[PDB]
Write a protein that binds this DNA or RNA. Structure first.
Lengths: 61, 205, 525, 82
RNA sequence: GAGACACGGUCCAGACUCCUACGGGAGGCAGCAGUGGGGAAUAUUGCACAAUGGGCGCAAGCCUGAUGCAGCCAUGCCGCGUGUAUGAAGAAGGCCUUCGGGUUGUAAAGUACUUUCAGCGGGGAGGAAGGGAGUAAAGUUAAUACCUUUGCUCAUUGACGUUACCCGCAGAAGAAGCACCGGCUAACUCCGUGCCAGCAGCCGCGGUAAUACGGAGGGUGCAAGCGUUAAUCGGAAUUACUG
RNA sequence: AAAUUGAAGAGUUUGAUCAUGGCUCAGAUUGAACGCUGGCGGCAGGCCUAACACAUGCAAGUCGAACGGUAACAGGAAGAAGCUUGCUUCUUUGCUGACGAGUGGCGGACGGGUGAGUAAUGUCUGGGAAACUGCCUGAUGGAGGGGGAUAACUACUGGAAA
């Protein structure tokens, strides 16, 4: 089992994601995180801080 | 690989003047030097011991314009050399080309001296040297190029250099615009407000 | 005056577009024989000669009878070098033919006279009128029963919507076929098959009215020919060089591929009428063909020729400059210099071959997918070529992907096919679905077959969906965002990160078009 | 047979050859029996760009070692200068 | 065969791929590139034997995907640049406000100066020692021939290559982003949400006044890199021989 | 003369304290991967997994100064003819410069790749005795006289090819 970080996701069944490791202290049995921005999992929309951790391109001014 | 932000901000955070400007004008007339930068500058939070060690290290690094990777290499070299680690590190920092150019007064600020070195206007022992981080050795004569010897900023910096104390380890001739680094500067020649022992114990955890 | 200038002036590019079973491959074989590259010519299916047509390199003639793969042959004429482009023509394909048409400076349409102009030719002619490309009309299979010349000319002119001008006029139809030129010189073939295999003897007799010729052919035929000829003169305009260049009028030549007669006449006329290559227009500026410096664009890419190892060959037209072996050509899109170590050229004749390729000559470049369709190779200039058709696909089908794994294999295969022009893949922003669209049904069939052949996935498809693709571009700021929020579900991303509105119905597209007028809906990307 | 040759031991575009006594079957920069000197092809003035242990080199030739063309030229240069 | 039970040698059996006239044959990239496949992931189907080295040859010379180079990749280490000096009307705008102002902030605009790196044009080492033709001398022999050795004269030998490097031209233009700010741990406030959405390496925040979520302003640390993950040691005197 | 110069802790059991005790962090490092961003140069590095399968090109040849020979070039000698009165077109002769194929010598056991197998038939450290070794090198000497084949080639012939 893997935790889906960020707010909101488009993940449905048969989606190819990339897990990377790192447990969440407060859930029994969840030990891994899915990276946002790899092969199907889109980045978190309207994110302007800590953008690298959730895979969103830089907003052009 | 160079800090391109506001210079006076660093001086405000360190509390003292880091000589990041020429020195023609009074520091108080350009900034609130006694007050830390930003919105919550008025408050003076109680700094931790790790905080005071880190502040001293950042203070020196901003004084000489060195970055962390280069500074850590300097520390490793100093620790490798024989003798007092703090004096060796201060000597190594003081042996840089642009720093020596500033001490000799060819450049008003260290940033100006660095741009002078980088823009092919300095010659160590007659050979053109372009690297700002070039270590100069004892008995080395440094001079401006013939083409760059007519720049207004150079003489404008030489006159300003008289207002500051004259380095006892250098011999400069303001007419021909040449100097001579005869020895590495002893700690007694350096400014005594820098507690280099903080850096030498911050980096040796 | 200089040799490079003389060579660019001599180079000519012409392509052939034809209806199914029109003998285009046989015609191509005859063209090579007339050009003197090959001593003998062989008809398709080996009906009269052991040899096979040059255009049908593979076994397509036996399998169906029509070319399925694009073929380029360069043949030398009298103090000129001519580039011959062969394109498969079908409603299912079409898009590839349009890319080839854009690259080729001039085009020739081949239709069997009995079969006629009827379908797919009007669409081809329409793309040529859009670019104002000169078009030549060639009638085929004159040995077979032929309908009245006035009637054929009128029907073809009616379908084309462009003036039709007949360079060669047939005095005979069916079993006996002879033709007359605008110069009043009469060309005849005494032997139907005797001279078919070798070069046909040039028995052309000067003078429109000749008693020996009148006696030899039918007297009724000669009188009817004279009446028809004067009527054609009055009814239809005489050939104009400027009008042909503009594309207003099309020259018509009547020839028989099986007979091997009239092909030489068409080649002679085509070489004199055809001009040196026009300057192509890049987005930055128009680039002169004569000017030095290597400039070219890749119109088509062929992939998966060998199953074990993939060796992508990119067909590129070098509009300006002359290629040199091992030259570093900058790719504008990647902004990097790539040395062209290996470049394939088609000598197509009994010649030693040369590495150097002159301007206007098609070059095949081996690559592993590095080159992409529409890429521009320039010596140093940062100029991007324009004019690639990129037409919208229709009749879209979703990919179910029954087996959860192998998606990366599917993705690599889908993007590679999408990089070529065979198929276009769209992903809706709202949901993670893959919808694949192509201009034609058999194009989908070919894509599915190729995918199974080498990318080897189950590729379950045909899930019900209704869609139309319109690329959306809005110059205005704060209006496009409103449009996106209003129809986020309909909007789908397309390759190259281009936003495309998906329309359930044509009427839905019209309603969408009336609403939000500042936003522009483009059929072509 | 036993040979005395050059071993390319340096950075890219700035070679430095080590004159080594190696068994000829082995690789260039590989196994050697004894190192007998160096040769800096791009050295400046005031520094010795070549030094050969001529006693050991003579001892190996007496032992049956052959000599390379470049090694022959270098011995010739050393004996001519010194 | 001196040396193999032999990657590009032989024979047999097994699985695979290919040619066939169906009788029968051919092959083994864990060599250099390179292709499907597996994987989070790893490059060009390049140039030259010019240098070093190997095989053959008396030698000239031929072969060498060894080797020297070039192409891609911030993969790591190191250096440099993205301007420098002056500049309070403390400009406008953002944010906070005790509505007094404070902060972004000499930062910007303006004024003067410089052209490093990238761009354009010109010049230009070194990696080249040799080898080949003519001599002159010496040694050998019947021989001033022929061969060998050493001097001198002559043209020459570079894939890299538009080499490194140097000189000149125009113009501050073509060049700054990433993580974090409750404590450990350097750096704080406002607004939206109310144990929801969410953060987290540990302790732990959030349940309608959050310095802990998301956004803004400000700040802190690094810098062509910055975070996260995987793996080892340290802290761990937490397998302690030292202990 | 130098060859070393070397040692930080903090959060968390309790209402609070001391001790024991685990978890976590600050540091360095990699053949690294991913996310965001990206200007130049120098030196290194780049299938860690499927020792899974390989299309195509190259990765071992050389010697006519060992030997019969001419399959090509290119010269000569005898010539012969359009004879431009000097060799333009052509027959021979390996006669010469060289050389495809073959016999023979040397090299294919080197160079280069990988870590599957191997927990000791291997590796590292240190000793030995019962040994062989092309090419390189030192000494001492030989190097006389015969024979029968066999490739290449010629003629016929099996096989689609090998």
């Amino acid at each position: 089992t893997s935790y889906i970080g960020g707010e909101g996701h488009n993940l449905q069944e048969h989606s190819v994601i990339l897990i990377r490791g790192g447990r969440v202290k407060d859930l029994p049995g969840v030990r891994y995180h899915t990276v946002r921005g790899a092969l199907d999992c889109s980045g978190v929309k309207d994110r302007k801080q800590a953008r690298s951790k959730y895979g969103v391109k830089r907003p052009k001014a | 690989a160079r800090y391109l932000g506001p210079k006076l901000k660093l001086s405000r955070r360190e509390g003292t003047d880091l000589f990041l400007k020429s020195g023609v004008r009074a520091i108080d007339t350009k900034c609130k030097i006694e007050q830390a930068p930003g919105q919550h500058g008025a408050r003076k939070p109680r700094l931790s011991d790790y905080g005071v060690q880190l502040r001293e290290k950042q203070k020196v690094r901003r004084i000489y314009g060195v970055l962390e990777r280069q500074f850590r290499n300097y520390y490793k070299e100093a620790a490798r050399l024989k003798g007092n680690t703090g004096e060796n590190l201060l000597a190594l920092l003081e042996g840089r080309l642009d720093n020596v150019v500033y001490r000799m007064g060819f450049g008003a600020t260290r940033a100006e001296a660095r741009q002078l070195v980088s823009h092919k206007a300095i010659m160590v022992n007659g050979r053109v040297v372009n690297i700002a981080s070039y270590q100069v050795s004892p008995n080395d004569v440094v001079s401006i190029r013939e083409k760059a010897k007519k720049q207004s900023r150079v003489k404008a910096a030489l006159e300003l250099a008289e207002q500051r104390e004259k380095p006892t380890w250098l011999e400069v001739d303001a007419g021909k615009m040449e100097g001579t680094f005869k020895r590495k500067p002893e700690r007694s020649d350096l400014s005594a407000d820098i507690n280099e022992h903080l850096i030498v114990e911050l980096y040796s955890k | 005056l200089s040799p490079y200038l003389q060579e660019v002036a001599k180079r000519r590019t012409f392509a052939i577009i034809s209806h199914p079973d029109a003998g285009k491959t046989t015609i191509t074989e005859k063209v090579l024989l007339f050009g003197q590259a090959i001593q003998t010519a062989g008809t398709v299916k080996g009906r009269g000669s052991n040899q096979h047509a040059k255009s049908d390199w593979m076994e397509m003639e036996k399998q169906r009878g029509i070319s399925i793969t694009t073929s380029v042959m360069q043949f030398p004429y009298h103090d000129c070098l001519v580039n011959l482009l062969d394109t498969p023509g079908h409603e299912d394909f079409s898009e590839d033919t349009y890319r080839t048409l854009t690259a080729v400076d001039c085009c020739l349409m081949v239709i069997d006279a009995a079969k006629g102009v009827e379908d797919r030719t009007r669409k081809l002619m329409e793309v040529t009128r859009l670019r104002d490309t000169p078009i030549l009309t060639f009638m085929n299979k004159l040995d077979r029963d032929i309908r009245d010349g006035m009637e054929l000319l009128d029907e073809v002119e009616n379908e084309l919507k462009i003036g039709c001008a007949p360079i060669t006029w047939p005095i005979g139809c069916g079993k006996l076929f002879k033709g007359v030129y605008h110069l009043y010189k009469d060309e005849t073939y005494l032997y139907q098959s005797g001279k078919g295999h070798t070069i046909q003897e040039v028995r052309i007799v000067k003078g429109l009215n000749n008693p020996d010729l009148d006696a030899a052919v039918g007297e009724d035929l000669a009188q009817q020919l004279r009446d028809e000829l004067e009527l054609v003169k009055g009814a239809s305009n005489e050939f104009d060089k400027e009008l042909f260049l503009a594309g207003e009028i099309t020259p018509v030549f009547f020839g028989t591929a099986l007979g091997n007669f009239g092909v030489d006449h068409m080649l002679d006329g085509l070489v004199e009428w055809a001009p040196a290559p026009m300057p192509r227009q890049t987005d930055t500026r128009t680039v002169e063909a004569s000017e030095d410096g290597g400039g070219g664009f890749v119109f088509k890419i062929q992939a998966n020729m060998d199953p074990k190892h993939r060796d992508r060959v990119a067909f590129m037209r070098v509009v300006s400059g002359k290629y040199e072996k091992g030259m570093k050509l900058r790719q504008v899109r990647t902004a990097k210099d790539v040395v062209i170590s290996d470049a394939l050229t088609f000598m197509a004749g009994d010649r030693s071959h040369v590495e150097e390729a002159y301007p206007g000559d098609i070059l095949g470049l081996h690559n592993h997918g590095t080159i992409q369709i529409g890429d521009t190779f320039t010596q140093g200039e940062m100029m991007k070529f324009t004019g690639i058709p990129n037409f919208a696909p229709e009749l879209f089908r979703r990919i179910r992907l029954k087996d959860p794994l192998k998606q990366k294999q599917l993705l690599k295969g889908l993007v590679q096919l999408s990089e070529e022009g065979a198929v276009q893949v769209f992903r809706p922003i709202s949901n993670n679905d893959l919808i694949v669209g192509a201009v034609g049904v058999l194009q989908f069939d070919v894509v599915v077959a190729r995918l199974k052949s080498e990318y080897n996935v189950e590729a379950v498809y045909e899930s019900v969906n209704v869609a139309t693709a319109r690329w959306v571009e809005c110059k205005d700021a704060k209006k496009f965002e409103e449009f996106k929020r209003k129809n986020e579900a309909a909007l789908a991303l397309d390759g190259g990160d281009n936003l495309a509105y998906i329309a359930t119905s044509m009427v839905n597209l019209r309603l969408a078009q009336e609403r939000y007028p500042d936003v522009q809906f483009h059929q072509t990307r | 047979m036993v040979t005395i040759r050059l071993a390319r031991h340096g950075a890219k575009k700035r070679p430095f050859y080590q004159v080594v006594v190696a068994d000829s079957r082995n690789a260039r920069n590989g196994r050697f029996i004894e190192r007998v000197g160096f040769f800096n092809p791009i050295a400046s003035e005031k520094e010795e760009g070549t030094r050969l242990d001529l006693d050991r080199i003579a001892h190996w030739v007496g032992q049956g070692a052959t000599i390379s063309d470049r090694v022959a030229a270098l011995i010739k240069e050393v004996n001519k200068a010194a």
